[PDB]
Design an enzyme around this catalytic site. Structure first.
Site, PDB file in Angstrom:
ATOM      1  N   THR A  69       0.219   0.674   3.798  1.00 26.50           N
ATOM      2  CA  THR A  69      -0.040   1.895   4.533  1.00 26.50           C
ATOM      3  C   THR A  69       0.842   3.023   3.995  1.00 26.50           C
ATOM      4  O   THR A  69       2.010   2.808   3.641  1.00 26.50           O
ATOM      5  CB  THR A  69       0.209   1.645   6.025  1.00 26.50           C
ATOM      6  OG1 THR A  69      -0.319   2.732   6.793  1.00 26.50           O
ATOM      7  CG2 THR A  69       1.699   1.463   6.319  1.00 26.50           C
ATOM      8  N   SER A  94      -0.099  -0.452  -6.931  1.00 28.70           N
ATOM      9  CA  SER A  94      -0.986   0.189  -7.908  1.00 28.70           C
ATOM     10  C   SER A  94      -0.575  -0.132  -9.338  1.00 28.70           C
ATOM     11  O   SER A  94      -1.426  -0.124 -10.243  1.00 28.70           O
ATOM     12  CB  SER A  94      -1.027   1.720  -7.715  1.00 28.70           C
ATOM     13  OG  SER A  94       0.057   2.371  -8.353  1.00 28.70           O
ATOM     14  N   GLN A  95       0.709  -0.423  -9.565  1.00 24.04           N
ATOM     15  CA  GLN A  95       1.127  -0.858 -10.891  1.00 24.04           C
ATOM     16  C   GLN A  95       0.402  -2.126 -11.341  1.00 24.04           C
ATOM     17  O   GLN A  95       0.454  -2.456 -12.527  1.00 24.04           O
ATOM     18  CB  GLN A  95       2.643  -1.082 -10.934  1.00 24.04           C
ATOM     19  CG  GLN A  95       3.137  -2.297 -10.115  1.00 24.04           C
ATOM     20  CD  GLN A  95       3.635  -1.891  -8.727  1.00 24.04           C
ATOM     21  OE1 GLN A  95       3.027  -1.057  -8.061  1.00 24.04           O
ATOM     22  NE2 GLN A  95       4.741  -2.470  -8.297  1.00 24.04           N
ATOM     23  N   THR A 113       0.576   5.510  -6.217  1.00 26.17           N
ATOM     24  CA  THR A 113       0.607   6.703  -7.052  1.00 26.17           C
ATOM     25  C   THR A 113       0.761   6.386  -8.528  1.00 26.17           C
ATOM     26  O   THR A 113       0.403   7.228  -9.370  1.00 26.17           O
ATOM     27  CB  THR A 113       1.737   7.640  -6.596  1.00 26.17           C
ATOM     28  OG1 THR A 113       2.995   6.963  -6.682  1.00 26.17           O
ATOM     29  CG2 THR A 113       1.515   8.100  -5.134  1.00 26.17           C
ATOM     30  N   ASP A 114       1.245   5.183  -8.856  1.00 25.70           N
ATOM     31  CA  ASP A 114       1.590   4.863 -10.241  1.00 25.70           C
ATOM     32  C   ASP A 114       0.368   4.932 -11.159  1.00 25.70           C
ATOM     33  O   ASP A 114       0.482   5.326 -12.323  1.00 25.70           O
ATOM     34  CB  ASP A 114       2.263   3.479 -10.302  1.00 25.70           C
ATOM     35  CG  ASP A 114       3.754   3.526  -9.938  1.00 25.70           C
TER      36      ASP A 114
END
EC number: 3.5.1.1
Lengths: 309, 311, 311, 309
Positions: B12, B43-44, B74-75
């Site tokens: 979250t 996300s990585q 965000t990565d």
């Protein structure tokens, strides 16, 4: 007037007859030129770096200042390597040209003048190795190529420039805090090769195969071009975590163009035996990892080098 | 109010557990929000399978809602948004959103980010603009947007062509739209697809080893993207490996490690000679996306190059 | 090749005397170029009369050529381009170009700048994009473009919404177009006009004097633009003078001294209460341009505000 | 733990009960707060500046460091004025908030923590008055509001930041070269007003009426927000040229957001008796002209002040 020595590593950026290609040089310095090598900077390599550092260290007493003409594509790498290995306390000013010397509004003539101006300014000493491009004086550590074609491409994207050049004069309002030139332990005078350091890229669905091939070849160190704050894709992470334990030096940097890869945030560097690159981008982190390996192999000691230089 | 679907891919980004409607209560002033978790990954560790999952899911449920919002780390949000920019066929808005600060931290950015991402997804004016990324009061197109700083809440920027609109008080003043063909207007169709062509990236730098590039040709990769230096130039050893590879089937795309600006056709490297493709403004992870989907369309470098000039 | 008309407003920006065809000889590879001097002024002395001269001249000679290029000093090129962006009715390209280095200096930028400005003006793809500024390999829309640095050859940037295309080797990869209505699509018509409404600008800062604002109301100015602080806020003394002025006929536009970002409607200042107009992304000299032309259309703040939201 | 004194000039930026609005403060400092005045920073003025500088100079011995909460719209002005007038050698850290404390993802809580972090760091002393915004440490001279709404709006657009803040720690890699705080002659301790300096804007078809009204009112100094490298529209130029000769101090700055207004380039400053602002933008140049007038009225002496501070 000061004696400035221009060291060429490739093709000309103006028009040695540089004095006649840009005749205003003679009004501000006594200029001579030597051709140390002649390659395109995309083929720049360890051999060129060592003879440059040796030549500048050797010839330091003969001249008042060095200007180095270099291609733009890797100028930010050579500037930082020299920033760490030059022991001469006279200015060393790197310059190139984003437009070829025979094209309209070529930038190299004026860049070269400004490079010479900077190299002859007594205010320029003790600021480490410099890069002079587009009327600006940038420190070798932070300066990086920001755009693929723009004449203004060279910027110090994290901490800013040292000074702006207007009409042959420089308002210097900053100096680099990290240790440079003399203040470093690194001495390459008697080295003939440099520790092998490769760089691997991180992305979605990233392959560990590139990292594994450098592990297989016994590379002394790897630099990771991470995602975000130095993060690695799971395959690359496992491969580099394994490699860390059996003696490879692993440095987490980031593909992201600005901002530090910081210690103990995303990754337990202590647990896995890694090193966080700080604001050194991958190609910059490689230059310091190469030189760090020549004094110690200990991951904690390299980290301290990365926090001091 | 419009109906808006949140698709989470990870943790979250706003707190106070898929049900973010309590964490940012003013969501009910702008939309009727429902949420599903489709995967839950950092996300990585993003990958082709998640990408295919998101696209098929958006394409199938398009009739069921008025717009989507995707929470994403965000990565690699910049790679997923461009992948979706090319595969989504739903005409409705698809807004991606993330958080540069943990949701439990001081001045966590997620809660206002998600709020603004729902505004965007519900805005009538957000249609036909392609897949979007909304971060820090800004609406960004999925192609040009990239993560600019390792830590800054303002990190996401469309660094070559700028943003599409700014968001103030739940309204957007749009002033641009991406002219490159997106979503519906592409030929890429992943609806019946279960995997993606293997495309790796290799870095260039002084004294660069050919070993990474060799390993991906030895593994039989379908494409290789080069993070070249300058205007997509290549170190010697890497030049030789990739020029070999290009003729023996492998599709090589020349991009650049430099964070802004185009890798142009035959600036210096003779692309037609070696059979190379130039990426334009697509950075190396952006170029991998388009090459992957182009390889499902064709294998010939001259027509992959047309794709890089159109999409 | 297309026919292209150069209109000079000042000194020459490329040397080697209106006849620049010898100074940049490769102009004849792309166009058939002819030139006229319409005035000869330092741009710091730009004025309404020159503006009306340029617009009427472009409007009348439109049939005679395929595109224009205007050489202009850099200090105020951003005001002239926006003025023309709103008054020119010729559908053909109008490209403005300048030089940040003297034409006799080392690495003078004018010669390549003018070259690229002719490329742009002759490019078929440059149509309907509004009045342009071409500087340093970049094509910039006339509204958002501003002079960003006092000396840098890269000074001109479209700082809020980015450039329209980059120019490499005489080709342009356009990827955006200004969505705000320009040129033909405006109502502003200066064809029969001989003067412009008097509009001044006043600066805000700590301990700001009301004297400059008072003097322009005492002179009976039709409008006043405020270079406010932050989101177009106003120092006390200046607030009082301008709130008075707004009710007694004067049209006040709140802009901001801050170099990027919108002055939005009723962020904090209650615009409807005092009868103010918010400028949006228009900086103070940009806002003066649009207010001037709006005052030739109407005098009512609520409909001037619609104009600032449309143009 | 260090004693940090928070000085408020307006409304709260977090949530004196700031310790309970942001409770993590108590883990890193002993914090007390005083309300010096309560206004919106767009109404900031000379009276507030003098009592702030006096209060910081007076209370310097009671505390370890100052944090000042201030509105964003004029924070860059007050920071430079204090940068020139504070004689206390403990850090003075200005902070504000681009989002109100009661709106979603308010920035003020974390900005305040970081401001306190910076004010308690021993590495922060001797760097002049600071502004801490969005995880960054910026010097009072160059820092300016760059965007009308962005949380990241505060940037040092000419020479860059001093350091980035991650996890309560600061990597300082720069310090301001221009003289600040103690190194300046300026002393406001016994002054109750400050010399009158106005700012006029330059544009196409620009009116001399604003400049004339300040001339008529006997203003001691005018700052020109020029076009380009400090250039003036012909009416304004004539009015300010006349005014220069009869004793008004005229400083050429520029409306352009980055870059210096340089001496002897566009304008014969020596001929007309002007002063070139350097990289000081109009509102910044006003702050130095105000203080320069309190030591000398000579245009050449002010110019030297503008090249030294």
């Amino acid at each position: 007037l000061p004696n400035i020595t221009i060291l060429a590593t490739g093709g000309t950026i103006a028009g040695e007859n540089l004095v006649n290609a840009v005749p205003q040089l003679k009004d501000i310095a006594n200029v001579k030129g030597e051709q140390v090598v002649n390659i395109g900077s995309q083929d720049m390599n360890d051999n060129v770096w060592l003879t440059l550092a040796k030549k500048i260290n050797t010839d330091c007493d003969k001249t008042d200042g060095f200007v180095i003409t270099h291609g733009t594509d890797t100028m930010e790498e050579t500037a930082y390597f020299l920033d760490l290995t030059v022991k001469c306390d006279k200015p060393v000013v790197m310059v190139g040209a984003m437009r070829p010397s025979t094209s309209m509004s070529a930038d190299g003539p004026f860049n070269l003048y400004n490079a010479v101006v900077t190299a002859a300014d007594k205010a320029s000493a003790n600021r480490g190795v410099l890069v002079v491009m587009n009327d600006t004086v940038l420190d070798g550590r932070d300066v990086t190529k920001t755009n693929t074609t723009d004449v203004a491409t060279f910027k110090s994207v994290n901490y800013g420039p040292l000074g702006y050049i207007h009409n042959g004069k420089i308002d210097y309002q900053r100096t680099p805090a990290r240790k440079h030139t003399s203040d470093t332990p690194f001495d390459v005078s008697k080295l003939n090769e440099l520790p092998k350091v490769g760089i691997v890229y991180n992305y979605a669905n990233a392959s560990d195969l590139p990292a594994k091939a450098l592990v297989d070849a016994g590379y002394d160190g790897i630099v990771s071009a991470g995602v975000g704050n130095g993060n690695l894709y799971k395959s690359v992470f496992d491969t580099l975590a394994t490699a860390a334990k059996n003696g490879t030096a692993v440095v987490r940097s980031s593909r992201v163009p600005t901002g530090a890869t910081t210690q103990d945030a995303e990754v337990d560097d202590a647990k896995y035996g890694f090193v966080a690159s700080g604001t050194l981008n991958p190609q910059k982190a490689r230059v310091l990892l190469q030189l760090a390996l020549t004094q110690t192999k200990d991951p904690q000691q390299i980290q301290q080098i990365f926090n001091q230089y």
